Design a protein around this ligand. Sequence first.
Ligand SMILES: *[C@@H]1O[C@H](CO)[C@@H](O[C@@H]2O[C@H](CO)[C@@H](O)[C@H](O)[C@H]2NC(C)=O)[C@H](O)[C@H]1NC(C)=O
Ligand SMILES: *[C@@H]1O[C@H](CO)[C@@H](O[C@@H]2O[C@H](CO)[C@@H](O)[C@H](O)[C@H]2NC(C)=O)[C@H](O)[C@H]1NC(C)=O
Lengths: 48, 48, 49
Amino acid sequence: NIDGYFKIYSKHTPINLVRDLPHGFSALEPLVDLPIGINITRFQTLLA
Amino acid sequence: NIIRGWIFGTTLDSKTQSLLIVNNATNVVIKVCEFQFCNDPFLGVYYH
Amino acid sequence: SNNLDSKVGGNYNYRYRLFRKSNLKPFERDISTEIYQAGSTPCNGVQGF
Ligand SMILES: *[C@@H]1O[C@H](CO)[C@@H](O[C@@H]2O[C@H](CO)[C@@H](O)[C@H](O)[C@H]2NC(C)=O)[C@H](O)[C@H]1NC(C)=O
Ligand SMILES: *[C@@H]1O[C@H](CO)[C@@H](O[C@@H]2O[C@H](CO)[C@@H](O)[C@H](O)[C@H]2NC(C)=O)[C@H](O)[C@H]1NC(C)=O
């Protein structure tokens, strides 16, 4: 979040790796900007 | 597909606004409201 | 907007935040209407000294 606009950048892998976060290089492309204007101090995940 | 989205905010109880990000079996829904969020938000699926 | 909205007994629809704890950042918005504490006390309920 910056000057009232929230932002999301995202990507996914082609790999089927063994167990832990790999040291390869692949940079995240921008997905969406959102004009939400809210003060955020904390966040939570939603699982199934 | 267990990660479904996120809550972002500060009070998380409709004292002030907060952002809901969710994916369900139809679409990604994005929403800002005076949300009285659950003390443990989730999605649940009856698998098979 | 006098010629759109000035009422003779004052157009008391409109409202603004008269006091807040601190400065708001650019393009932030705060709707939360809770009581201001000018006295040092942990003020609660609808009013106080
Ligand atoms: C995913 O969430 C959205 C948002 O709530 C659901 O969209 C609803 O769809 C029905 C049928 O068209 C409408 O009557 C509602 O008005 C929609 N909701 C909103 C807020 O407008 C969608 O159905 C959800 N899908 C699942 C599988 O839960
Ligand atoms: C954004 O949210 C936080 C929490 O509601 C505010 O942080 C507080 O700031 C005051 C004044 O400096 C301090 O007394 C508190 O100790 C802070 N709390 C925390 C959790 O850090 C912040 O001021 C808010 N800002 C805006 C612009 O809304």
